[PDB]
Design a protein around this ligand. Structure first.
Ligand code: CUA
Ligand code: CUA
Ligand SMILES: [Ca+2]
Ligand SMILES: [Cl-]
Ligand SMILES: [Cl-]
Ligand code: NA
Ligand code: NA
Ligand SMILES: [Zn+2]
Ligand SMILES: [Zn+2]
Ligand SMILES: [Zn+2]
Lengths: 572, 588
């Protein structure tokens, strides 16, 4: 019987972390499960006024040249794994708008690395290698473009127009390799060995899921059998068909129809491709892929071992670890629970009903996610279905509507809907982790790589950031270094010339957890947060003569209103 | 009382939350405490394009160059002392602005940078006869002019000002120079009086200086006297601003016609009008008290019928350590946050008044522990004469261990408290991001929203005007207008297709894309993202939205609809083709 408690009362704690995509708003959100309350927002592709992400020197360093963009469009959050289990080190997420992948460090809950994927447009599908650990982040570029894209050729049917499958080194956040494919890439997942990955493709009665022999790709890179594109040193391999001949790197498995979701069962047996236009899912037996690539099978369709008929508009699939799959039906507006091995037997002709239950959801579900579903520890406790049209499920709030993320108890034989959670800007997908899988820092380490370049800059100025309160003058450049301890800035006044470029570096030397300080320069567009033992810095030009106040934004003390300072700007 | 809202049940109240240091406004359902919408205001929102679109940057004016805000005080317009659901207003302390949100479309529709001031903090609205004025405090003392020759806060031309904004036009109405500084503010239930707390009567810049005086004050404004002087032309102007400026400073101990200074301890903070209209209540902060100013004694005070400004104080209850803010249940009780003691204290106002007259009576009814260090608190409808005494939200600054650990930056703790009975009851801990200062609640039936835009909505009326000069009918046209190195693309959109699915420009062209969502079904929103150009916006049904960007990269560049709108949403795409600069006339 499904009967878990969903109420988390005052003083009680949630059981799981939920990491929500921020959708078209560009951030990552940390929720508590089952309360579904948002505990934290992690800025990634958005500019965050509160913490200064996008404004501070540390954040703009991480974003690189892409710091010039104020937008992102993220969909697919995933947590790094060791031996097919979450290891709590990193979260990765895509940006479809400006073609990026970001890495979030789960000990500090901040984006610490970001890469613009070269020579592609629109990073959409994204998932992680599971075994032996997350060595690679796999990322789909959705849209076919010319190569080179220099304006001579616009023809998408040209022999050099294509998109590519992308592998990023998870630990260094540099590109590992790219594989040219036929068609457009949609979603992707990986197996439980490290040898294989797979992606649904459209555009090309039948499209396909393309399967990658990552071992074969790696071997070619080690031997130097690759090309490069443009000014990127990324190894590029050709996984397209040539005159009907297969690459060593890819096999194309025909699947109906404009397939969408591409999900690996937690027992490692199947890549399950959701049918979308076809009221089916297609089940690819991962154990038959070695024979496929070895040329031992008569037809790529022979790796298909199941094609259950589920209902109208299957989009995504998740797993309870008990042998059931759960699939969103976008048109029927349902989650369907079905037994995978019974579907496999049905495909062989046995009369057996693999469908267990259909639960109405509200309305038009897209992604769905069961707790630990991407790991061999899938625990079958909670399911979230992320529905696009909330209609009358919440109070009206004008022409824009919230997404409806519905929490469903799957611990028993029958799915039970227990909570409707409204969300902003269409998160699309989420991922859950056990409380004990996530370990966070209470206070920053003074050696943290997040602000190590700022420590380096201070070193060149002869500054001990833990103690110093000093103003360095360097032509028209002014570098203010200060400590802060509630309720006082360590430098409470400084004077500059109009036009000077001012950098303010603040080190919070409070040692009590949770005592954040802020720094805002009034009417200059300057804002940032500094947590205990963090160093943060921000650069702006003092283009206005006169007295200009700065203040601590984050309530830190009974005397917070009075934690202020003055920048005095002498006229030109 | 219904505390938990099940699937298919609806919340009973709207909550409008300050976005804190993040710069937006949030719409919550109460009592579920779930977030139903984010309304971008001072922040740049990737999802809707606020801060990127031409419509939003036009509303922000020159301040569109700032990517940050710091907002604290959301309040809803009123008619005869009750919410009328028309507008919400909120401050920006970071870049000295006031913004207006239209509650029918749930969008910021007007914004103003307040002239000749720094840091708009306290903000509240006239209640009676209606919200004609938005009252806003500028917190920091600055030189006038602030041209860099004088930096001294003690100079006779160094001061801050109280600001009144015309709520309907969102232009400045007047400003009143005050002594000291300004913290929080509220208005009475007659229209004559407003009041503000001051913590820097010392006009200092160091912590010790700002704490020296035993008493600062709440400054009371005679708005009738201010309006009379404006109509008589008895005012000045500062800089290039035409705003009437009135001098509310004391001159050698002589009061101005516009202000009275009521001594109040000490660095007081909250300034709250009781729902029965009897009191301005100032929270003592460094003093363990609140001071109760009797509004019905203010006409006598301005008429010289009182010898001491302290004579308008009729209560000063001792409550606890660090009183910051007070709210009201409409049953005669006040509720005050104690920041240091970390509690909400319930007390009877009329019994506190009798205690001030010497009658020993225990006006304190209950102290409820909160978690931890509460700042603002708000009871449902507390700002109106309909204060209903049902829900109370206390907004605490340090959540410590009340939620799962999330790293060095913690959420804040907004705690929902049942006050419908004699005993305050803590029912829900709500984590929030970026420290919302205050919130405001309204009954479900006090808010009326549109599901479909009107084609003449002023929000995009300037875009309609621009289209007309190109001979465009936005409801039907799919056209590419060329004008030198500018390209103006106009298209309708109807799921799952953009009306213009490709267009060609020259490298360096300045491209404006204007999209009119001609779907007429509720909640079919479209998006528009140009890949790798930093371009993103939303277009809701019957809205026109536009965005301008430079086509700085040659080659083919995809654009796509970001908001899921249709089963074939992934087909709602298009292509911009950019011919290379070397194939066109060369400039430098
Ligand atoms: Cu430091 Cu508030
Ligand atoms: Cu229009 Cu999705
Ligand atoms: Ca003082
Ligand atoms: Cl998927
Ligand atoms: Cl207040
Ligand atoms: Na990088
Ligand atoms: Na304006
Ligand atoms: Zn997706
Ligand atoms: Zn999907
Ligand atoms: Zn306050």
């Amino acid at each position: 019987e499904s009967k878990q408690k969903i109420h988390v009362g005052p003083g009680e704690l949630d059981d799981y972390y939920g990491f929500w995509s921020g959708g078209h708003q560009g951030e990552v959100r940390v929720l508590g499960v089952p309360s579904m309350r948002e505990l934290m927002r992690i800025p990634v592709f958005n500019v965050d006024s509160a913490t200064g992400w996008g404004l501070t020197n540390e954040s703009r360093h991480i974003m690189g040249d892409s710091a010039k963009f104020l937008n992102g469009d993220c969909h697919h959050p995933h947590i790094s794994m060791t031996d097919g289990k979450y290891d709590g080190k990193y979260l990765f997420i895509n940006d479809k708008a400006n073609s990026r992948v970001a890495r979030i460090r789960l000990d500090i809950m901040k984006c610490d690395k970001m890469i613009t994927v070269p020579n592609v447009q629109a990073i959409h599908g994204l998932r992680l290698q599971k075994v032996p650990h997350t060595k690679y982040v796999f990322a789909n570029a959705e849209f076919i473009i010319p190569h080179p894209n220099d304006g001579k050729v616009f023809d998408l049917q040209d022999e050099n127009s294509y998109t590519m499958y992308n592998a990023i080194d998870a630990e260094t956040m540099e590109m590992a390799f790219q594989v040219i494919v036929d068609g457009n890439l949609d979603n992707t997942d990986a197996d439980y060995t490290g040898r294989f990955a797979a992606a649904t493709c459209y555009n090309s009665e039948r499209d396909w899921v393309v399967v990658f022999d990552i071992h074969a790709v790696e071997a070619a890179v080690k031997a130097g059998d690759f090309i490069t594109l443009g000014d990127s040193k990324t190894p590029v391999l050709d996984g397209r068909k040539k005159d009907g001949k297969d690459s060593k790197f890819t096999r194309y498995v025909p699947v109906p129809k404009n397939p969408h979701g591409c999900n690996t069962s937690s027992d490692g047996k199947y890549f399950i491709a959701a049918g979308k236009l076809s009221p089916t899912c297609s089940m690819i037996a991962i154990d038959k892929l070695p024979d496929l690539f070895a040329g031992k099978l008569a037809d790529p369709r022979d790796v298909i071992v199941g094609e259950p008929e589920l209902g109208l508009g299957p989009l995504h699939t998740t797993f309870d670890g008990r042998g059931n799959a759960y699939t969103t039906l976008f048109i029927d507006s349902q989650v369907v629970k079905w037994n995978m091995e019974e579907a496999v037997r049905a495909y062989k002709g046995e009369k057996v009903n693999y469908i267990k239950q259909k639960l109405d959801v509200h309305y038009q579900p897209g992604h769905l996610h069961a707790s630990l579903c991407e790991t061999n520890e899938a625990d079958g406790k909670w399911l979230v279905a992320l529905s696009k049209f909330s209609k009358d499920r919440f109070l009206p709030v004008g022409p824009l509507h919230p997404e409806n993320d519905q929490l469903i108890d799957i611990s028993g034989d029958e799915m039970k809907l227990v909570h409707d959670g409204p969300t902003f800007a269409e998160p699309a997908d989420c991922i859950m982790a056990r409380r004990d899988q996530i370990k966070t820092k209470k206070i920053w380490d003074r050696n943290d790589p997040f602000f190590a370049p700022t420590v380096e800059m201070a070193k060149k100025d002869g500054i001990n950031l833990d103690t110093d309160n000093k103003v360095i003058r360097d032509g028209n450049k002014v570098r203010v270094y200060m400590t802060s301890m509630a309720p006082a800035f360590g430098v409470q006044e400084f004077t500059v010339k109009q036009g000077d470029e001012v950098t303010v570096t603040i080190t919070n030397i409070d040692q009590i957890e949770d005592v954040s300080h802020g720094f805002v320069v009034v009417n200059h567009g300057v804002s940032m947060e500094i947590s205990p033992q963090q160093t943060s810095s921000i650069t702006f030009v003092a283009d206005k003569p006169g007295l200009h106040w700065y203040y601590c934004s984050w309530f830190c003390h009974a005397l917070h209103m009075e934690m202020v300072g003055r920048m005095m700007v002498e006229p030109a």
